[PDB]
Write a protein that holds these residues in place. Sequence first.
Motif: not given
Lengths: 9, 563
Positions: B451-476
């Motif tokens: 959407a284009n109707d927000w600028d700031i938001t909060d998220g929270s994650w129960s993280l995957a149990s391996e520290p790499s954050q590819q699956d949160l932030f990778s380009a795809a």
Amino acid sequence: SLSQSLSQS
Amino acid sequence: KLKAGNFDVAYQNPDKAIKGGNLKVAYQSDSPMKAQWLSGLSNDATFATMSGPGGGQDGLFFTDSGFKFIKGGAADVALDKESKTATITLRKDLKWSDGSEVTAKDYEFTYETIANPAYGSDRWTDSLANIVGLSDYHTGKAKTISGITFPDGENGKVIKVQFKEMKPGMTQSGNGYFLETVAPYQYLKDVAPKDLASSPKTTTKPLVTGPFKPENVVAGESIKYVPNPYYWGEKPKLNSITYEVVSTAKSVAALSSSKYDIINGMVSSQYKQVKNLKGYKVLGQQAMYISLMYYNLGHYDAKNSINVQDRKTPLQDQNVRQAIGYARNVAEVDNKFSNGLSTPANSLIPPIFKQFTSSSVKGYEKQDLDKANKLLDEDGWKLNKSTGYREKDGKELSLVYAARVGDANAETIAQNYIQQWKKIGVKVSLYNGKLMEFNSWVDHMTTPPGANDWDITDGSWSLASEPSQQDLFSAAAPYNFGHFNDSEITKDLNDIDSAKSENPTYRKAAFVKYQEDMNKKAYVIPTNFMLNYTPVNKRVVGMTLDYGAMNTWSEIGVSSAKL
């Protein structure tokens, strides 16, 4: 957990 | 005073467990349960947790307390470095809850539920692009996944996965580079892909592999679990487990009345109430969790699986993103409301990942209004003394904050941040003038193109149990909710999982650079680390939070009956 999951808080 | 892991992880009960018993468990949620038994089609922590007695969306592998794969679960996994492969071997006696066989095809089918866009999954990742042939399957260039093969056929028990490169996290659950669940292909094969997520067969009437099966599901509310006679492992002690959602407002009273034996997901703000309950033992541990503030910086192209950082907004300016981070009073909020359980985060890698978290990295954990004001000045956002807000070209620095529903302090805390932003001359309003319901927020964040109707938001994650954050932030990844795309960050993410990062000294340096760069670019701002607590009724036998405890649903029982 085995995957990243969204939490409500 | 921040509490330390000086909670007990286990309630070591000296009373014997009975044969039978009816355990009552709840997950604290103000939003309705979203039953989805297929891991690839489910995005939320609440249901992932509630699915635990059923096998946790049919997880395959046992681990130690450090999440390293071990042998003896529903399946084993073996890596071969020089071929760049994983071999997954399902147990000979692994069955579905209808008594049918779990086979190699059931494992491959998991990959299709995510990679074939016809199912509507939000779990495509660049991590999955590292499986030979899987990208081409994902775009429809190939009709099969060439990198997934079956040494003993589709109805055998063995699957080989071929990778482009090996990744250091592959010895650890939650690595993301290979999947860890099965889906019942013979039960689901005639459901049109577009209809699978809403089918009774993945919601109210699933097949599962765990120690219990869901006898009944009340949509939005509850699960009645009874023993699954086809389970390969330890036979459970209990006759049943009910698992229900409970609202934030009703949780504490439900412990006082012994309605629930265990409540999971309880907020930090309620800890003072819970600690004083004599009928309960409170367990706790560092949370595999992060909360963070997101900026809306682009859109997601689902057809081509790419986050495109093309949104026209003042938040494209690094000084503005940094200023808005420095202006928050996260520590003040945590001190007032969190009962010592929430600690302002300095980075995106939480303390549970002891080796790769970096305690000396500086983030936005300390309010600095002076610094925030300077950054905006220097970026040309000059204060209009008449209004008290900053401007450029007669355009006001005004933003929309999609804050979420939460506990009794959620609106107060959101407004506290809006007031801090006013102090730096940024006008911030709540999305549609009120807090956003969670299930609605998830839809708003994950539904392409964004959407284009927000600028700031909060998220929270129960993280995957391996520290790499590819699956949160990778380009795809659709989970990159603000849709940033930055070559420096992509290189950082990749370097963390490179062959050179098989050396832990090199990988540590890579995690440090990533943590620093993410804080500097400020596409997201880390918010909180948490300690989780869990009240357990004193009648419960064999309860433990130990991450290495693999048979807890079979072992857990009660020492006396519920009234």
